[PDB]
Amino acid sequence: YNVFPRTLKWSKMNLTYRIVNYTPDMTHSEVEKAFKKAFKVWSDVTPLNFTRLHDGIADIMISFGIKEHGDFYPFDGPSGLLAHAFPPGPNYGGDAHFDDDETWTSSSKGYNLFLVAAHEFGHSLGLDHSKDPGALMFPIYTYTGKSHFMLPDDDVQGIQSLYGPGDED
Ligand SMILES: Cc1cc(CNC(=O)c2cc(C(=O)NCc3ccc(F)c(C)c3)ncn2)ccc1F
Numbered sequence: 001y002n003v004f005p006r007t008l009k010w011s012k013m014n015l016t017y018r019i020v021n022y023t024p025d026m027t028h029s030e031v032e033k034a035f036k037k038a039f040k041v042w043s044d045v046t047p048l049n050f051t052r053l054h055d056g057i058a059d060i061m062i063s064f065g066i067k068e069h070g071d072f073y074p075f076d077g078p079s080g081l082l083a084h085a086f087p088p089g090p091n092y093g094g095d096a097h098f099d100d101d102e103t104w105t106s107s108s109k110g111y112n113l114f115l116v117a118a119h120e121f122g123h124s125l126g127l128d129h130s131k132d133p134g135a136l137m138f139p140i141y142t143y144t145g146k147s148h149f150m151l152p153d154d155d156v157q158g159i160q161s162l163y164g165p166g167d168e169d
């Protein structure tokens with residue numbers, strides 16, 4: 001027999017993702033690079049592996065949409081909500097949605113897609129919001145301006161509480 005896991009998490013280390021569509025704001029290459037880097041933020045500190053699918057059903061379906069887009073969390077035009085992701089689970093579980101009424105960039109202007117994506121994938125993997133103002137999972141977008149991204153310890157401890165550290169070096 002098997003009882004449901006204690007925490008909401010993926011029961012397999014091999015996860016797949018698919019970029020269903022693209023925002024008008026960035027080139028396909030820029031978007032792909034941003035998401036790849038965002039997944040690496042988490043795979044680097046756990047035993048998780050992320051493989052990209054170009055079609056079909058992936059564990060983490062990624063899409064850009066506006067207003068009503070297929071769930072109970074419609075976006076709201078420019079400003080306000082910017083994105084959200086569902087926790088681990090069947091069907092839409094793990095999926096990540098980005099409000100395409102926002103401005104997405106690979107710089108410090110508007111919302112940095114990589115940064116927001118890293119945050120959303122944290123949710124896709126089982127992390128909720130943190131009270132640490134400097135955490136990636138803090139609820140409010142707070143671009144620091146630093147030239148190098150480093151996953152804050154709070155996030156490292158959180159993600160490893162779910163999946164273990166994988167290779168520690
Ligand atoms: C090269 C480089 C360097 C950096 C430097 N790092 C940061 O600025 C940074 C920001 C955050 C942060 O604001 N967290 C909260 C949050 C984040 C996203 C999101 F959608 C919501 C709703 C809330 N946390 C940790 N570090 C960034 C991008 C980049 F490309």
Ligand SMILES: [Ca+2]
Binds near residue numbers: 079102
């Ligand atoms: Ca919005």
Ligand SMILES: [Ca+2]
Binds near residue numbers: 058060091092
């Ligand atoms: Ca899914």
Ligand SMILES: [Zn+2]
Binds near residue numbers: 069070071073
């Ligand atoms: Zn949605």
Ligand SMILES: [Zn+2]
Binds near residue numbers: 129137139
């Ligand atoms: Zn969030």
